[PDB]
Design an enzyme around this catalytic site. Structure first.
Site, short mmCIF file in Angstrom:
data_model
loop_
_atom_site.label_atom_id
_atom_site.label_comp_id
_atom_site.label_asym_id
_atom_site.label_seq_id
_atom_site.Cartn_x
_atom_site.Cartn_y
_atom_site.Cartn_z
N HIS C 232 0.80 -1.20 0.00
CA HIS C 232 0.00 0.00 0.00
C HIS C 232 0.85 1.27 0.00
O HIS C 232 0.60 2.17 -0.79
CB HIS C 232 -0.94 0.00 1.21
CG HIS C 232 -1.94 1.12 1.22
ND1 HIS C 232 -3.28 0.93 0.93
CD2 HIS C 232 -1.81 2.45 1.49
CE1 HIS C 232 -3.92 2.08 1.02
NE2 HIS C 232 -3.05 3.02 1.36
N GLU C 236 1.24 3.90 -3.30
CA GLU C 236 0.75 5.24 -3.18
C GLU C 236 1.88 6.25 -3.50
O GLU C 236 1.66 7.31 -4.12
CB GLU C 236 0.17 5.36 -1.78
CG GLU C 236 -1.04 6.20 -1.64
CD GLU C 236 -2.27 5.82 -2.48
OE1 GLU C 236 -2.77 6.71 -3.22
OE2 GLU C 236 -2.80 4.69 -2.34
N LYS C 239 2.36 6.16 -7.44
CA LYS C 239 1.38 6.97 -8.18
C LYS C 239 1.74 8.46 -8.10
O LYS C 239 1.65 9.16 -9.08
CB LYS C 239 -0.02 6.79 -7.65
CG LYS C 239 -0.61 5.43 -7.89
CD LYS C 239 -2.15 5.42 -7.69
CE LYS C 239 -2.54 5.62 -6.19
NZ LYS C 239 -3.90 6.27 -6.03
N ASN C 240 2.15 8.95 -6.94
CA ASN C 240 2.50 10.36 -6.81
C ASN C 240 3.69 10.70 -7.70
O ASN C 240 3.71 11.73 -8.38
CB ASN C 240 2.86 10.73 -5.38
CG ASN C 240 1.68 10.62 -4.41
OD1 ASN C 240 0.53 10.58 -4.79
ND2 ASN C 240 2.00 10.61 -3.14
#
Ligand SMILES: Nc1ncnc2c1ncn2[C@@H]1O[C@H](COP(=O)(O)OP(=O)(O)OP(=O)(O)O)[C@@H](O)[C@H]1O
Ligand SMILES: Nc1ncnc2c1ncn2[C@@H]1O[C@H](COP(=O)(O)OP(=O)(O)OP(=O)(O)O)[C@@H](O)[C@H]1O
Ligand SMILES: O=C(O)CCCC[C@@H](S)CCS
Ligand SMILES: O=C(O)CCCC[C@@H](S)CCS
Ligand SMILES: [K+]
Ligand SMILES: [K+]
Ligand SMILES: [K+]
Ligand SMILES: [K+]
Ligand SMILES: [Mg+2]
Ligand SMILES: [Mg+2]
Lengths: 381, 97, 381, 97
Positions: C232, C236, C239-240
């Site tokens: 997770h 995340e 993606k950023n």
């Protein structure tokens, strides 16, 4: 005279921006104006600090050294207050005031080491608990930040109106450089750290410098700044990096990795990243690196434990910052952030008010978040 | 008349301050006040100062609204009373011993 | 039933280490023991949170969505409390308790989005001030941290004693992996982010991965951990990074720099550094990146503003952390720190006590440190 | 006799706690206590808990010194009194209404 202290301690400091220092020095440069400002501002700043030193635990307040600092500040305060009703129209006033500034600065020369001996004397002679530790930390950051600020103010006035027609740095504005070339200060700070590392370790890593001016790509990176502050931060981070690298590799065959400096410039920030492969620091220990007198050197280049927190005060003084990130087992990044814009570079000054008072009369509180037992139940039955 | 009350005057919060903008109120009409709570942001020429309550009580009325620029020294900014029953008595505007 | 809430809210949570979960699952695995623990621990943790949700501003407490969350928690709490005097010696009890855990988990499926709608509804419908903002922040970090923890506990029990003789991940211990290969989870998190970035941007940077196991040099880096948590966080951050890189370069000729991952292992830390040349973030904005619902995406890969703070909750949950450092104008480093040692990986859990209460009934205080005027005096006269 | 006083008993601070180590005292004999101040770190098997004062007063005497392992539930840990003149009266060891 304690009523005068109470009163001035209740006045708010007047934070100034680099822009203002520069605009005053360049375009204006009116001695009268500076005098009207300083005769009031210095006592305010002094009184704000004294009020705080008075809130220290009695066993620290009791050390000869802390007493000395107090009397010095008190003597300075009283000496500036003599001017509150003296006319700037008389040139004599202006002149003696200048002498007084020089006087207070000389008197304030010893202050940093005297307070250090103060708290060292205390830490080693009286038992030490963490309530009182974070308090001394809080006090020292603030107390030394004001010292930086008095010196900044006094330097501007004396450099400007000292009338010295032989100035060391002619194109400057007091101690401000309108076109401070950043990589040049990096190189200087480095050469001077190298010298010291080479003297004791018989060897020192090479510097590699790299730049990226996003503002205007091929152009050297310049900023409006106090060069000596920038120099100090860099010097101090470089000594740490050189020690870490040299110690890690003195028993290796690999040969010494360089210390890499990346200087960048964006819309808001001038960032300077110093990277070493000196082995790093476990996460658990990162905060305490910033405690006054936390050191891993024989109690070499290191010893005092002042380099990192003082450097961070210089960075925060004009709205910048200094942060550290390690990968334990490889190395560390130390990053100085400055404001790109002098119009945004305001003094950040300790204010004495109820919020500050509260920090000194806090009391341990329960933790917010859980803690485990020091001897947890063996889940194997 | 009105019950025992105190007027908070705008002080010289800086050695040269002669006026200040009431930038924000930090307490609401009817709220308790202890010695040292934050009462208002006062903006000048030189700083944005956090003005602290100097005397414990209750905020009865705001005399000078948020946003008022250039408030001279000595302007009553608001009213403090000793007990919270005494607030309602100030809706429409020496025993403090 | 509010007395039961008062009472349990006053009990302290019992933080568990990864070691304990693993030692319990591997060597012990006694259903009775788990039951004795959970029937008490779950209600404690629930009550600690409920006590806090009750301290929220009334205008947030009033939203339908916050009410729903409250009733769900209350229903769960009451359902677990039925077991406080049921004997583990009867197998039926054990069995129904398992069903109850499944039940509460399903009921708690919606909780994250329901609370989000809750505060979104509130932020957009009622005016928003910073006292209340940092408070919602404080509440949400804690509220979501407990949710992670209930799910952790419930997952261990159901995976262990669900009796499922067809387990998805056979060599694991509940959801713990004793030999989690870190670079493999990095690669997976990356491929799955790439897919999403490629779907909308028609392009995605390459991953480059590098390792340094200071613990034992040539060896792949493994840790005892919950793979899905690690996954997770990485997903995340990737993606950023991909968004930042792709957006910066879609108008350039340079072609896309890679996203570099460095995985290191030392005596105490497992560190994972994700580096991008995606342009970075000015220092002033770094903290707010971590505010729930702070986003710069059309309100793409981004939108919600949950990625960064939730990822940081997973990191802090077992005594790790997630930190971000940018050089504005070039790029950003995002670093996940884990404990190397499972014996050191304790749950970090919100405790309701006076310290917490105080956070909700704080009140604006004067600033400690100076602030300048929004219109400073022009020093040019 | 002694003046009005309260004995702070060691509670079950966790659902299964049956004893606890008095790891540290956070208040000193003679110090003020408000509802909710941190009184002591109590260590168990399962956590290191911050024990909070449940009733406002003054710390008169510590009955159980720092470091004492395995203190059973219900052990008086210390004594609280209503006024700070009443402390000295406890050196050598129903109007609380
Ligand atoms: N780049 C680095 N790599 C590894 N450890 C570091 C690094 N920089 C600082 N440290 C740690 O932080 C400690 C304190 O740093 P600091 O510079 O404040 O004090 P010192 O170097 O120990 O003495 P001095 O007062 O002159 O700086 C160092 O002793 C070292 O353990
Ligand atoms: N690597 C990065 N480079 C530049 N900016 C970043 C980076 N990572 C995060 N940010 C900034 O932080 C903001 C919030 O991050 P966050 O991931 O929490 O929310 P989001 O990406 O905006 O949506 P999501 O909830 O799915 O993550 C981003 O919108 C972006 O402005
Ligand atoms: O007042 C205020 C503005 C002060 C501008 C003059 C300062 S720079 C005095 C010389 S240090
Ligand atoms: O009590 C305490 C130790 C608890 C060990 C068992 C835990 S792991 C229950 C299963 S989640
Ligand atoms: K002040
Ligand atoms: K240090
Ligand atoms: K609790
Ligand atoms: K965010
Ligand atoms: Mg040093
Ligand atoms: Mg995101």
């Amino acid at each position: 005279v304690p009523k005068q202290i109470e009163r001035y301690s209740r006045f708010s400091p007047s934070p100034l921006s680099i822009k203002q220092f520069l605009d005053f020095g360049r375009d204006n440069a009116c001695e009268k104006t500076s005098y009207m400002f300083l005769r009031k501002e210095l006592p305010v700043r002094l009184a704000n600090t004294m009020r705080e030193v008075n809130l220290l635990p009695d066993n620290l307040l009791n050390r000869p050294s802390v007493g000395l600092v107090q009397s010095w500040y008190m003597q300075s305060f009283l000496e500036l207050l003599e001017y509150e009703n003296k006319s700037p129209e008389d040139p004599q006033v202006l002149d003696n005031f200048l002498q007084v500034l020089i006087k207070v600065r000389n008197r304030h020369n010893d202050v940093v080491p005297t307070m250090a001996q103060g708290v060292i004397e205390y830490k080693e002679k009286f038992g030490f608990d963490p309530f009182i530790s974070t308090n001394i930390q809080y006090f020292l950051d603030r107390f030394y930040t004001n010292r930086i600020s008095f010196r900044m103010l006094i330097n501007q006035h004396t450099l400007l109106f000292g009338g010295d027609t032989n100035p060391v740095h002619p194109k400057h504005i007091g101690s401000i450089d309108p076109t401070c070339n950043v990589a040049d200060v990096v190189k200087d700070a480095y050469e001077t750290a190298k010298m010291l590392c080479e003297q004791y370790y018989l060897v020192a890593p090479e510097l590699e410098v790299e730049e990226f001016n996003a503002k205007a790509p091929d152009k050297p990176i310049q900023v409006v700044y106090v060069p000596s502050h920038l120099f100090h931060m860099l010097f101090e981070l470089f000594k740490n990096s050189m020690r870490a690298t040299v110690e890690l590799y003195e028993d290796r065959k690999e040969g010494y990795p360089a210390v890499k400096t990346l200087v960048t410039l964006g819309k808001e920030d001038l960032s300077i990243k110093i990277s070493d492969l000196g082995g790093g620091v476990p996460l658990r220990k990162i905060d305490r690196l910033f405690n006054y007198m936390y050191s891993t050197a024989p109690r070499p280049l290191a010893g005092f434990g002042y380099g990192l927190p003082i450097s961070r005060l210089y960075a925060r003084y004009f709205q910048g910052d200094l942060k550290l990130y390690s990968m334990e087992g490889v190395g560390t990044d130390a990053v100085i952030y400055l404001k790109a814009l002098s119009s945004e570079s305001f003094e950040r000054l300790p204010v004495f008010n109820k919020s500050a008072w509260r920090h000194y009369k806090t009391t341990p509180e329960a933790d917010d978040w859980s803690n485990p037992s020091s001897e947890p139940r063996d889940a194997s039955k | 008349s009105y019950p025992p009350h105190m007027q908070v005057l705008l002080p010289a919060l800086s050695p040269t301050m002669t006026m200040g903008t009431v930038q924000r109120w930090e307490k609401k009409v009817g709220e308790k006040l202890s010695e040292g709570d934050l009462l208002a942001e006062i903006e000048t020429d030189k700083a944005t100062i956090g003005f602290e309550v100097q005397e414990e009580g209750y905020l009865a009325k705001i005399l000078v609204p948020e946003g008022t620029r250039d408030v001279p020294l000595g302007t009553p900014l608001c009213i403090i009373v000793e007990k919270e029953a005494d607030i309602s008595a100030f809706a429409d505007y020496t025993d403090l011993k």
